[PDB]
């Protein structure tokens, strides 16, 4: 059964055992207020949707999770590989106004409870991190550019060097994202990814016609995490494809570039 399991409303809970101490999941497209190409639980404030609808969609998730919107932290998501540590002093950044999101980064982490990391997705890989013993959670957004930039291994490096967490204490869930079934790229993309994998490494793409590659970004990120020291048995990978599962997900590719965003989220409750 998939590690992301449908809840009673428009979200999937991350059911990997190491995440049992966290509020962790990914929304589906249903149960919201948005219309047209954004129908209906569009969580993205920077896709041209009605802001009132989007904020109400976020308030709806906050109700489902019992995790108030005032406690979320969002980031700009510039398709780079930069990551920011956040704390309760960052709560609300980007939660209702995109202009206040943490700028210039594509991943966040925190070692505090009461802080919901919240990133938007519609094909790119959501990478959830937890070190349960140490109370760390993290979340990163990895499309091809962020993967080429090594964002997944950068999170691990920051936890090791700044938070003094061995990679062996880290657990990862790679969430729903576009699969190689639906994601075809060119030599430019694969060439940018080759340097990030070990020399002996199996390549997470297949050339389906000359110069065209079916690319598995989930596996690319898994291979990077393994190389950074995260144990194989600590890495859980969803098989769900955002493009394929049209009844659950917005997809930038399938929806031809005008669509909503799901929210990936992780945080720990404050008692
Ligand atoms: O509210 C938002 N927060 C973060 N990114 C957003 C938002 N709305 C639209 N995008 C866009 O969605 C992609 C992430 O997969 C990024 O390209 C970002 O610019
Ligand atoms: Zn993206
Ligand atoms: Zn697919």
PDB file of C-alpha atoms and ligand atoms in Angstrom:
ATOM      1  CA  UNK A   1       0.000   0.000   0.000  1.00  0.00           C
ATOM      2  CA  UNK A   2       1.265   3.479  -0.815  1.00  0.00           C
ATOM      3  CA  UNK A   3       3.027   5.376   1.939  1.00  0.00           C
ATOM      4  CA  UNK A   4       0.629   8.306   1.268  1.00  0.00           C
ATOM      5  CA  UNK A   5      -2.860   7.194   2.270  1.00  0.00           C
ATOM      6  CA  UNK A   6      -6.152   8.968   1.657  1.00  0.00           C
ATOM      7  CA  UNK A   7      -7.739  10.678   4.649  1.00  0.00           C
ATOM      8  CA  UNK A   8     -11.413  11.501   5.145  1.00  0.00           C
ATOM      9  CA  UNK A   9     -11.003  14.873   3.376  1.00  0.00           C
ATOM     10  CA  UNK A  10      -8.817  16.256   0.585  1.00  0.00           C
ATOM     11  CA  UNK A  11      -5.410  15.075   1.810  1.00  0.00           C
ATOM     12  CA  UNK A  12      -3.085  12.095   1.946  1.00  0.00           C
ATOM     13  CA  UNK A  13      -1.253  11.314   5.169  1.00  0.00           C
ATOM     14  CA  UNK A  14       2.364  10.191   5.103  1.00  0.00           C
ATOM     15  CA  UNK A  15       2.069   6.745   6.682  1.00  0.00           C
ATOM     16  CA  UNK A  16       5.735   5.774   6.828  1.00  0.00           C
ATOM     17  CA  UNK A  17       6.348   4.689  10.467  1.00  0.00           C
ATOM     18  CA  UNK A  18       9.143   7.217  11.154  1.00  0.00           C
ATOM     19  CA  UNK A  19       6.683  10.071  10.424  1.00  0.00           C
ATOM     20  CA  UNK A  20       4.121   8.873  12.972  1.00  0.00           C
ATOM     21  CA  UNK A  21       5.194  11.625  15.389  1.00  0.00           C
ATOM     22  CA  UNK A  22       4.553  14.392  12.863  1.00  0.00           C
ATOM     23  CA  UNK A  23       1.673  15.970  11.016  1.00  0.00           C
ATOM     24  CA  UNK A  24       2.799  15.148   7.473  1.00  0.00           C
ATOM     25  CA  UNK A  25       0.943  14.854   4.198  1.00  0.00           C
ATOM     26  CA  UNK A  26       0.025  16.209   0.795  1.00  0.00           C
ATOM     27  CA  UNK A  27      -3.341  17.686  -0.156  1.00  0.00           C
ATOM     28  CA  UNK A  28      -5.468  16.500  -3.083  1.00  0.00           C
ATOM     29  CA  UNK A  29      -7.320  18.813  -5.419  1.00  0.00           C
ATOM     30  CA  UNK A  30     -10.774  18.432  -3.848  1.00  0.00           C
ATOM     31  CA  UNK A  31     -12.709  20.178  -1.099  1.00  0.00           C
ATOM     32  CA  UNK A  32     -11.852  23.799  -1.867  1.00  0.00           C
ATOM     33  CA  UNK A  33     -13.242  27.082  -3.151  1.00  0.00           C
ATOM     34  CA  UNK A  34     -11.259  27.706  -6.334  1.00  0.00           C
ATOM     35  CA  UNK A  35     -12.709  27.594  -9.825  1.00  0.00           C
ATOM     36  CA  UNK A  36     -11.816  26.798 -13.394  1.00  0.00           C
ATOM     37  CA  UNK A  37      -8.301  25.474 -13.916  1.00  0.00           C
ATOM     38  CA  UNK A  38      -7.723  25.773 -10.158  1.00  0.00           C
ATOM     39  CA  UNK A  39     -10.712  23.611  -9.175  1.00  0.00           C
ATOM     40  CA  UNK A  40     -10.867  23.358  -6.253  1.00  0.00           C
ATOM     41  CA  UNK A  41      -8.325  23.079  -3.356  1.00  0.00           C
ATOM     42  CA  UNK A  42      -5.686  25.255  -4.950  1.00  0.00           C
ATOM     43  CA  UNK A  43      -3.115  26.132  -2.303  1.00  0.00           C
ATOM     44  CA  UNK A  44      -0.824  28.262  -4.484  1.00  0.00           C
ATOM     45  CA  UNK A  45      -0.878  32.037  -4.057  1.00  0.00           C
ATOM     46  CA  UNK A  46       1.314  32.678  -7.107  1.00  0.00           C
ATOM     47  CA  UNK A  47      -0.543  30.975  -9.944  1.00  0.00           C
ATOM     48  CA  UNK A  48      -3.070  33.685 -10.796  1.00  0.00           C
ATOM     49  CA  UNK A  49      -5.973  32.355  -8.734  1.00  0.00           C
ATOM     50  CA  UNK A  50      -8.255  34.462  -6.583  1.00  0.00           C
ATOM     51  CA  UNK A  51      -6.386  35.155  -3.357  1.00  0.00           C
ATOM     52  CA  UNK A  52      -9.514  34.991  -1.209  1.00  0.00           C
ATOM     53  CA  UNK A  53     -10.277  31.505  -2.522  1.00  0.00           C
ATOM     54  CA  UNK A  54      -6.683  30.346  -1.966  1.00  0.00           C
ATOM     55  CA  UNK A  55      -6.547  31.698   1.598  1.00  0.00           C
ATOM     56  CA  UNK A  56      -9.881  30.000   2.331  1.00  0.00           C
ATOM     57  CA  UNK A  57      -8.471  26.739   0.919  1.00  0.00           C
ATOM     58  CA  UNK A  58      -5.490  27.072   3.251  1.00  0.00           C
ATOM     59  CA  UNK A  59      -7.817  27.831   6.184  1.00  0.00           C
ATOM     60  CA  UNK A  60      -9.753  24.677   5.278  1.00  0.00           C
ATOM     61  CA  UNK A  61      -6.623  22.502   5.487  1.00  0.00           C
ATOM     62  CA  UNK A  62      -5.742  24.231   8.763  1.00  0.00           C
ATOM     63  CA  UNK A  63      -9.163  23.122  10.060  1.00  0.00           C
ATOM     64  CA  UNK A  64      -8.668  19.546   8.863  1.00  0.00           C
ATOM     65  CA  UNK A  65      -5.232  19.377  10.498  1.00  0.00           C
ATOM     66  CA  UNK A  66      -6.096  21.399  13.612  1.00  0.00           C
ATOM     67  CA  UNK A  67      -2.928  23.350  12.767  1.00  0.00           C
ATOM     68  CA  UNK A  68      -3.739  27.063  12.415  1.00  0.00           C
ATOM     69  CA  UNK A  69      -2.680  28.948   9.305  1.00  0.00           C
ATOM     70  CA  UNK A  70      -0.923  31.506  11.540  1.00  0.00           C
ATOM     71  CA  UNK A  71       1.600  28.756  12.403  1.00  0.00           C
ATOM     72  CA  UNK A  72       2.633  27.831   8.854  1.00  0.00           C
ATOM     73  CA  UNK A  73       5.917  28.836   7.177  1.00  0.00           C
ATOM     74  CA  UNK A  74       6.190  29.031   3.383  1.00  0.00           C
ATOM     75  CA  UNK A  75       9.016  29.869   1.000  1.00  0.00           C
ATOM     76  CA  UNK A  76       9.338  31.494  -2.388  1.00  0.00           C
ATOM     77  CA  UNK A  77      10.268  28.256  -4.230  1.00  0.00           C
ATOM     78  CA  UNK A  78      12.574  29.632  -6.904  1.00  0.00           C
ATOM     79  CA  UNK A  79      13.604  26.210  -8.283  1.00  0.00           C
ATOM     80  CA  UNK A  80      17.005  26.440  -6.709  1.00  0.00           C
ATOM     81  CA  UNK A  81      18.713  24.314  -4.086  1.00  0.00           C
ATOM     82  CA  UNK A  82      18.827  26.691  -1.095  1.00  0.00           C
ATOM     83  CA  UNK A  83      17.318  25.772   2.279  1.00  0.00           C
ATOM     84  CA  UNK A  84      16.485  27.851   5.368  1.00  0.00           C
ATOM     85  CA  UNK A  85      16.165  26.812   9.002  1.00  0.00           C
ATOM     86  CA  UNK A  86      13.039  28.378  10.493  1.00  0.00           C
ATOM     87  CA  UNK A  87      11.588  28.811  13.978  1.00  0.00           C
ATOM     88  CA  UNK A  88       8.437  30.101  15.641  1.00  0.00           C
ATOM     89  CA  UNK A  89       9.653  33.624  14.816  1.00  0.00           C
ATOM     90  CA  UNK A  90       8.966  32.820  11.149  1.00  0.00           C
ATOM     91  CA  UNK A  91       5.369  31.696  11.639  1.00  0.00           C
ATOM     92  CA  UNK A  92       3.008  33.276   9.158  1.00  0.00           C
ATOM     93  CA  UNK A  93       5.677  34.021   6.544  1.00  0.00           C
ATOM     94  CA  UNK A  94       4.008  33.427   3.203  1.00  0.00           C
ATOM     95  CA  UNK A  95       0.953  31.873   4.838  1.00  0.00           C
ATOM     96  CA  UNK A  96      -1.576  34.400   3.529  1.00  0.00           C
ATOM     97  CA  UNK A  97       0.632  36.770   1.489  1.00  0.00           C
ATOM     98  CA  UNK A  98       3.118  35.286  -0.982  1.00  0.00           C
ATOM     99  CA  UNK A  99       5.325  38.382  -0.700  1.00  0.00           C
ATOM    100  CA  UNK A 100       6.229  37.493   2.911  1.00  0.00           C
ATOM    101  CA  UNK A 101       7.344  33.921   2.165  1.00  0.00           C
ATOM    102  CA  UNK A 102      10.945  33.081   3.061  1.00  0.00           C
ATOM    103  CA  UNK A 103      12.770  34.418  -0.013  1.00  0.00           C
ATOM    104  CA  UNK A 104      15.052  32.612  -2.397  1.00  0.00           C
ATOM    105  CA  UNK A 105      14.769  29.088  -0.999  1.00  0.00           C
ATOM    106  CA  UNK A 106      13.163  25.797  -1.974  1.00  0.00           C
ATOM    107  CA  UNK A 107      13.399  23.924   1.300  1.00  0.00           C
ATOM    108  CA  UNK A 108      12.829  24.560   4.971  1.00  0.00           C
ATOM    109  CA  UNK A 109      13.546  22.757   8.200  1.00  0.00           C
ATOM    110  CA  UNK A 110      12.857  23.259  11.892  1.00  0.00           C
ATOM    111  CA  UNK A 111      13.606  21.614  15.206  1.00  0.00           C
ATOM    112  CA  UNK A 112      10.681  23.327  16.965  1.00  0.00           C
ATOM    113  CA  UNK A 113       7.132  22.131  17.474  1.00  0.00           C
ATOM    114  CA  UNK A 114       4.194  24.314  16.515  1.00  0.00           C
ATOM    115  CA  UNK A 115       5.617  25.228  13.089  1.00  0.00           C
ATOM    116  CA  UNK A 116       4.047  23.786   9.930  1.00  0.00           C
ATOM    117  CA  UNK A 117       6.422  23.790   6.969  1.00  0.00           C
ATOM    118  CA  UNK A 118       4.263  24.225   3.878  1.00  0.00           C
ATOM    119  CA  UNK A 119       5.410  24.005   0.236  1.00  0.00           C
ATOM    120  CA  UNK A 120       3.439  23.911  -3.021  1.00  0.00           C
ATOM    121  CA  UNK A 121       3.609  21.176  -5.655  1.00  0.00           C
ATOM    122  CA  UNK A 122       2.090  20.079  -8.971  1.00  0.00           C
ATOM    123  CA  UNK A 123       4.588  17.576 -10.447  1.00  0.00           C
ATOM    124  CA  UNK A 124       7.894  18.415  -8.692  1.00  0.00           C
ATOM    125  CA  UNK A 125       9.199  16.078  -6.031  1.00  0.00           C
ATOM    126  CA  UNK A 126       8.191  16.781  -2.403  1.00  0.00           C
ATOM    127  CA  UNK A 127      10.934  15.442  -0.135  1.00  0.00           C
ATOM    128  CA  UNK A 128       9.959  15.070   3.529  1.00  0.00           C
ATOM    129  CA  UNK A 129      12.664  14.641   6.184  1.00  0.00           C
ATOM    130  CA  UNK A 130      12.447  13.636   9.825  1.00  0.00           C
ATOM    131  CA  UNK A 131      14.971  12.882  12.531  1.00  0.00           C
ATOM    132  CA  UNK A 132      12.516  11.670  15.206  1.00  0.00           C
ATOM    133  CA  UNK A 133      14.988  11.425  18.064  1.00  0.00           C
ATOM    134  CA  UNK A 134      16.159  15.013  17.538  1.00  0.00           C
ATOM    135  CA  UNK A 135      12.788  16.569  16.753  1.00  0.00           C
ATOM    136  CA  UNK A 136      13.819  17.794  13.276  1.00  0.00           C
ATOM    137  CA  UNK A 137      11.476  17.940  10.327  1.00  0.00           C
ATOM    138  CA  UNK A 138      12.256  19.240   6.858  1.00  0.00           C
ATOM    139  CA  UNK A 139      10.616  19.664   3.502  1.00  0.00           C
ATOM    140  CA  UNK A 140      12.162  20.344   0.101  1.00  0.00           C
ATOM    141  CA  UNK A 141      10.848  21.091  -3.389  1.00  0.00           C
ATOM    142  CA  UNK A 142      12.858  19.347  -6.108  1.00  0.00           C
ATOM    143  CA  UNK A 143      12.134  19.765  -9.774  1.00  0.00           C
ATOM    144  CA  UNK A 144      14.859  19.034 -12.261  1.00  0.00           C
ATOM    145  CA  UNK A 145      16.724  22.260 -11.453  1.00  0.00           C
ATOM    146  CA  UNK A 146      16.705  21.774  -7.686  1.00  0.00           C
ATOM    147  CA  UNK A 147      17.712  18.140  -8.159  1.00  0.00           C
ATOM    148  CA  UNK A 148      20.576  19.232 -10.427  1.00  0.00           C
ATOM    149  CA  UNK A 149      21.498  21.645  -7.611  1.00  0.00           C
ATOM    150  CA  UNK A 150      21.589  18.848  -5.070  1.00  0.00           C
ATOM    151  CA  UNK A 151      18.829  20.125  -2.790  1.00  0.00           C
ATOM    152  CA  UNK A 152      18.172  16.698  -1.268  1.00  0.00           C
ATOM    153  CA  UNK A 153      21.782  16.170  -0.226  1.00  0.00           C
ATOM    154  CA  UNK A 154      22.032  19.804   0.880  1.00  0.00           C
ATOM    155  CA  UNK A 155      19.349  19.162   3.512  1.00  0.00           C
ATOM    156  CA  UNK A 156      21.337  16.176   4.792  1.00  0.00           C
ATOM    157  CA  UNK A 157      24.562  18.205   4.810  1.00  0.00           C
ATOM    158  CA  UNK A 158      22.935  21.006   6.804  1.00  0.00           C
ATOM    159  CA  UNK A 159      21.516  18.580   9.360  1.00  0.00           C
ATOM    160  CA  UNK A 160      24.951  16.972   9.768  1.00  0.00           C
ATOM    161  CA  UNK A 161      27.111  20.089   9.835  1.00  0.00           C
ATOM    162  CA  UNK A 162      24.823  22.614  11.531  1.00  0.00           C
ATOM    163  CA  UNK A 163      22.502  20.375  13.574  1.00  0.00           C
ATOM    164  CA  UNK A 164      25.010  17.562  14.346  1.00  0.00           C
ATOM    165  CA  UNK A 165      22.655  14.812  13.127  1.00  0.00           C
ATOM    166  CA  UNK A 166      24.220  11.753  11.527  1.00  0.00           C
ATOM    167  CA  UNK A 167      22.606  10.762   8.203  1.00  0.00           C
ATOM    168  CA  UNK A 168      21.818   7.383   9.779  1.00  0.00           C
ATOM    169  CA  UNK A 169      19.333   9.175  12.059  1.00  0.00           C
ATOM    170  CA  UNK A 170      17.400  10.651   9.125  1.00  0.00           C
ATOM    171  CA  UNK A 171      14.302   9.194   7.481  1.00  0.00           C
ATOM    172  CA  UNK A 172      12.855  10.434   4.207  1.00  0.00           C
ATOM    173  CA  UNK A 173       9.558  10.144   2.372  1.00  0.00           C
ATOM    174  CA  UNK A 174       9.534  11.041  -1.331  1.00  0.00           C
ATOM    175  CA  UNK A 175       5.967  12.005  -2.123  1.00  0.00           C
ATOM    176  CA  UNK A 176       3.689  12.003  -5.165  1.00  0.00           C
ATOM    177  CA  UNK A 177       5.294  13.604  -8.208  1.00  0.00           C
ATOM    178  CA  UNK A 178       5.393  13.235 -11.955  1.00  0.00           C
ATOM    179  CA  UNK A 179       6.656   9.830 -13.031  1.00  0.00           C
ATOM    180  CA  UNK A 180       8.807   8.769 -15.967  1.00  0.00           C
ATOM    181  CA  UNK A 181       5.561   7.464 -17.432  1.00  0.00           C
ATOM    182  CA  UNK A 182       4.748  11.123 -18.171  1.00  0.00           C
ATOM    183  CA  UNK A 183       7.932  13.240 -17.839  1.00  0.00           C
ATOM    184  CA  UNK A 184      10.129  13.382 -20.949  1.00  0.00           C
ATOM    185  CA  UNK A 185      13.169  15.682 -21.011  1.00  0.00           C
ATOM    186  CA  UNK A 186      16.107  16.463 -23.307  1.00  0.00           C
ATOM    187  CA  UNK A 187      19.883  16.066 -23.130  1.00  0.00           C
ATOM    188  CA  UNK A 188      20.187  19.424 -21.366  1.00  0.00           C
ATOM    189  CA  UNK A 189      18.223  18.181 -18.364  1.00  0.00           C
ATOM    190  CA  UNK A 190      19.861  14.777 -18.045  1.00  0.00           C
ATOM    191  CA  UNK A 191      23.311  16.314 -18.603  1.00  0.00           C
ATOM    192  CA  UNK A 192      22.713  18.663 -15.670  1.00  0.00           C
ATOM    193  CA  UNK A 193      21.760  15.687 -13.494  1.00  0.00           C
ATOM    194  CA  UNK A 194      24.638  13.354 -14.379  1.00  0.00           C
ATOM    195  CA  UNK A 195      27.209  15.204 -12.200  1.00  0.00           C
ATOM    196  CA  UNK A 196      25.070  14.774  -9.072  1.00  0.00           C
ATOM    197  CA  UNK A 197      25.064  10.958  -9.058  1.00  0.00           C
ATOM    198  CA  UNK A 198      27.914   8.609  -8.110  1.00  0.00           C
ATOM    199  CA  UNK A 199      30.029   7.501 -11.079  1.00  0.00           C
ATOM    200  CA  UNK A 200      28.946   3.833 -10.819  1.00  0.00           C
ATOM    201  CA  UNK A 201      25.334   4.815 -10.334  1.00  0.00           C
ATOM    202  CA  UNK A 202      22.372   3.454 -12.306  1.00  0.00           C
ATOM    203  CA  UNK A 203      20.816   6.353 -14.190  1.00  0.00           C
ATOM    204  CA  UNK A 204      17.251   7.347 -13.287  1.00  0.00           C
ATOM    205  CA  UNK A 205      16.182   7.893 -16.878  1.00  0.00           C
ATOM    206  CA  UNK A 206      15.673   5.904 -20.081  1.00  0.00           C
ATOM    207  CA  UNK A 207      16.179   7.197 -23.622  1.00  0.00           C
ATOM    208  CA  UNK A 208      12.829   6.516 -25.281  1.00  0.00           C
ATOM    209  CA  UNK A 209      13.706   8.121 -28.612  1.00  0.00           C
ATOM    210  CA  UNK A 210      16.859   9.879 -29.772  1.00  0.00           C
ATOM    211  CA  UNK A 211      17.552  12.786 -27.437  1.00  0.00           C
ATOM    212  CA  UNK A 212      14.405  12.214 -25.356  1.00  0.00           C
ATOM    213  CA  UNK A 213      14.526  10.704 -21.869  1.00  0.00           C
ATOM    214  CA  UNK A 214      11.825   9.419 -19.574  1.00  0.00           C
ATOM    215  CA  UNK A 215      13.050  10.859 -16.280  1.00  0.00           C
ATOM    216  CA  UNK A 216      12.351   9.532 -12.765  1.00  0.00           C
ATOM    217  CA  UNK A 217      13.027  12.495 -10.459  1.00  0.00           C
ATOM    218  CA  UNK A 218      11.910  10.455  -7.447  1.00  0.00           C
ATOM    219  CA  UNK A 219      14.697   7.943  -8.074  1.00  0.00           C
ATOM    220  CA  UNK A 220      17.201  10.686  -8.871  1.00  0.00           C
ATOM    221  CA  UNK A 221      16.548  12.185  -5.440  1.00  0.00           C
ATOM    222  CA  UNK A 222      16.648   8.769  -3.768  1.00  0.00           C
ATOM    223  CA  UNK A 223      20.066   8.077  -5.304  1.00  0.00           C
ATOM    224  CA  UNK A 224      21.334  11.450  -4.093  1.00  0.00           C
ATOM    225  CA  UNK A 225      20.046  10.792  -0.564  1.00  0.00           C
ATOM    226  CA  UNK A 226      21.740   7.398  -0.508  1.00  0.00           C
ATOM    227  CA  UNK A 227      24.990   9.030  -1.616  1.00  0.00           C
ATOM    228  CA  UNK A 228      24.634  11.612   1.179  1.00  0.00           C
ATOM    229  CA  UNK A 229      24.428   8.796   3.747  1.00  0.00           C
ATOM    230  CA  UNK A 230      20.715   8.295   4.363  1.00  0.00           C
ATOM    231  CA  UNK A 231      20.178   4.527   4.764  1.00  0.00           C
ATOM    232  CA  UNK A 232      18.234   2.717   2.044  1.00  0.00           C
ATOM    233  CA  UNK A 233      15.743   1.328   4.586  1.00  0.00           C
ATOM    234  CA  UNK A 234      15.054   4.868   5.848  1.00  0.00           C
ATOM    235  CA  UNK A 235      13.857   6.144   2.434  1.00  0.00           C
ATOM    236  CA  UNK A 236      10.202   5.595   1.526  1.00  0.00           C
ATOM    237  CA  UNK A 237       9.039   6.409  -2.007  1.00  0.00           C
ATOM    238  CA  UNK A 238       5.446   6.996  -3.083  1.00  0.00           C
ATOM    239  CA  UNK A 239       4.486   5.323  -6.362  1.00  0.00           C
ATOM    240  CA  UNK A 240       1.784   7.924  -7.068  1.00  0.00           C
ATOM    241  CA  UNK A 241       2.184   9.971 -10.263  1.00  0.00           C
ATOM    242  CA  UNK A 242       0.632  13.460 -10.232  1.00  0.00           C
ATOM    243  CA  UNK A 243       0.115  13.429 -13.989  1.00  0.00           C
ATOM    244  CA  UNK A 244      -1.465   9.957 -14.037  1.00  0.00           C
ATOM    245  CA  UNK A 245      -3.782  10.349 -11.029  1.00  0.00           C
ATOM    246  CA  UNK A 246      -5.831  13.147 -12.549  1.00  0.00           C
ATOM    247  CA  UNK A 247      -8.697  12.630 -10.110  1.00  0.00           C
ATOM    248  CA  UNK A 248      -6.444  13.425  -7.161  1.00  0.00           C
ATOM    249  CA  UNK A 249      -3.839  15.908  -8.383  1.00  0.00           C
ATOM    250  CA  UNK A 250      -3.070  19.117 -10.193  1.00  0.00           C
ATOM    251  CA  UNK A 251      -0.281  18.572 -12.720  1.00  0.00           C
ATOM    252  CA  UNK A 252       1.668  21.370 -14.379  1.00  0.00           C
ATOM    253  CA  UNK A 253       2.479  19.093 -17.303  1.00  0.00           C
ATOM    254  CA  UNK A 254      -0.874  17.344 -17.791  1.00  0.00           C
ATOM    255  CA  UNK A 255      -2.861  20.545 -17.229  1.00  0.00           C
ATOM    256  CA  UNK A 256      -0.716  22.426 -19.770  1.00  0.00           C
ATOM    257  CA  UNK A 257       0.773  24.902 -17.337  1.00  0.00           C
ATOM    258  CA  UNK A 258      -2.339  26.527 -15.857  1.00  0.00           C
ATOM    259  CA  UNK A 259      -3.408  24.653 -12.747  1.00  0.00           C
ATOM    260  CA  UNK A 260      -3.517  24.675  -8.975  1.00  0.00           C
ATOM    261  CA  UNK A 261      -1.004  23.539  -6.410  1.00  0.00           C
ATOM    262  CA  UNK A 262      -1.207  20.914  -3.732  1.00  0.00           C
ATOM    263  CA  UNK A 263       0.412  21.681  -0.378  1.00  0.00           C
ATOM    264  CA  UNK A 264       2.974  19.338   1.127  1.00  0.00           C
ATOM    265  CA  UNK A 265       3.301  19.924   4.831  1.00  0.00           C
ATOM    266  CA  UNK A 266       5.194  18.678   7.851  1.00  0.00           C
ATOM    267  CA  UNK A 267       5.261  19.820  11.467  1.00  0.00           C
ATOM    268  CA  UNK A 268       5.028  18.657  15.054  1.00  0.00           C
ATOM    269  CA  UNK A 269       2.199  19.530  17.396  1.00  0.00           C
ATOM    270  CA  UNK A 270       2.856  21.628  20.505  1.00  0.00           C
ATOM    271  CA  UNK A 271       1.145  20.117  23.564  1.00  0.00           C
TER     272      UNK A 271
HETATM  273  O1  LIG B   1       1.914  29.953  -2.947  1.00  0.00           O
HETATM  274  C1  LIG B   1       2.874  29.522  -3.525  1.00  0.00           C
HETATM  275  N1  LIG B   1       4.014  29.172  -2.767  1.00  0.00           N
HETATM  276  C2  LIG B   1       5.193  28.635  -3.386  1.00  0.00           C
HETATM  277  N2  LIG B   1       5.266  28.430  -4.805  1.00  0.00           N
HETATM  278  C3  LIG B   1       4.101  28.781  -5.652  1.00  0.00           C
HETATM  279  C4  LIG B   1       2.978  29.291  -5.046  1.00  0.00           C
HETATM  280  N3  LIG B   1       2.096  29.489  -5.976  1.00  0.00           N
HETATM  281  C5  LIG B   1       2.621  29.174  -7.158  1.00  0.00           C
HETATM  282  N4  LIG B   1       3.874  28.742  -6.977  1.00  0.00           N
HETATM  283  C6  LIG B   1       4.888  28.191  -7.894  1.00  0.00           C
HETATM  284  O2  LIG B   1       4.740  26.787  -7.830  1.00  0.00           O
HETATM  285  C7  LIG B   1       6.018  26.141  -8.021  1.00  0.00           C
HETATM  286  C8  LIG B   1       6.209  25.131  -6.919  1.00  0.00           C
HETATM  287  O3  LIG B   1       6.029  23.804  -7.404  1.00  0.00           O
HETATM  288  C9  LIG B   1       7.069  27.250  -8.106  1.00  0.00           C
HETATM  289  O4  LIG B   1       7.420  27.459  -9.484  1.00  0.00           O
HETATM  290  C10 LIG B   1       6.349  28.488  -7.569  1.00  0.00           C
HETATM  291  O5  LIG B   1       6.766  29.686  -8.209  1.00  0.00           O
HETATM  292 ZN1  LIG B   2       8.318  22.980  -8.869  1.00  0.00          ZN
HETATM  293 ZN1  LIG B   3       2.400   9.239 -14.974  1.00  0.00          ZN
END
